[PDB]
Amino acid sequence: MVNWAAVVDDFYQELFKAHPEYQNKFGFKGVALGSLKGNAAYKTQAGKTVDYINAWIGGSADAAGLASRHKGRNVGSAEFHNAKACLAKACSAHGAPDLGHAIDDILSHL
Ligand code: HEM
Numbered sequence: 001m002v003n004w005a006a007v008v009d010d011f012y013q014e015l016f017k018a019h020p021e022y023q024n025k026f027g028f029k030g031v032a033l034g035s036l037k038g039n040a041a042y043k044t045q046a047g048k049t050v051d052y053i054n055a056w057i058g059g060s061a062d063a064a065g066l067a068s069r070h071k072g073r074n075v076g077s078a079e080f081h082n083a084k085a086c087l088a089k090a091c092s093a094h095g096a097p098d099l100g101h102a103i104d105d106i107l108s109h110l
Helices: 004-018 020-025 033-038 040-058 063-071 077-093 100-107
Strands: none
Touching: 004 020, 004 033, 004 040, 004 077, 033 040, 040 100, 063 100, 077 100
16 A cells, blocks of 8 residues: 555655744644654644545545645645655655646645
């Protein structure tokens, strides 16, 4: 099976390298990037991200709900456009299918 856990880990590395301030919105604020995998808050968040990707592939993703929840953290289209790029990098790094359409789907509600 596609190693989505590894893709997501690389996704967050790319995302927070390019936009460190995004990390401040999470329960793992301030944690060194090389230590995220040993952080309990990060582990929970990464697992939810993996679940969302598997839901999108499986046909059950709630893009409206995910969008609404991100608006609820003042995260919007600009951040998701930036995320699209980081996730494309992470997918390519793993020979994984591109997830741009999943991000576009979320973007359609932002
Ligand atoms: C690849 C695009 C992204 C995906 C698939 C994604 C997915 C998720 C999921 C599944 C959750 C949990 C929602 C829930 O529990 O109901 C979440 C929460 C969250 N996301 Fe994202 N996200 C993405 C991009 C971003 C970006 C760019 C930011 C910018 C800061 C962000 C900030 C947050 C924050 C602050 C939370 C709440 C975390 C908490 O409850 O402590 N996300 N995201």
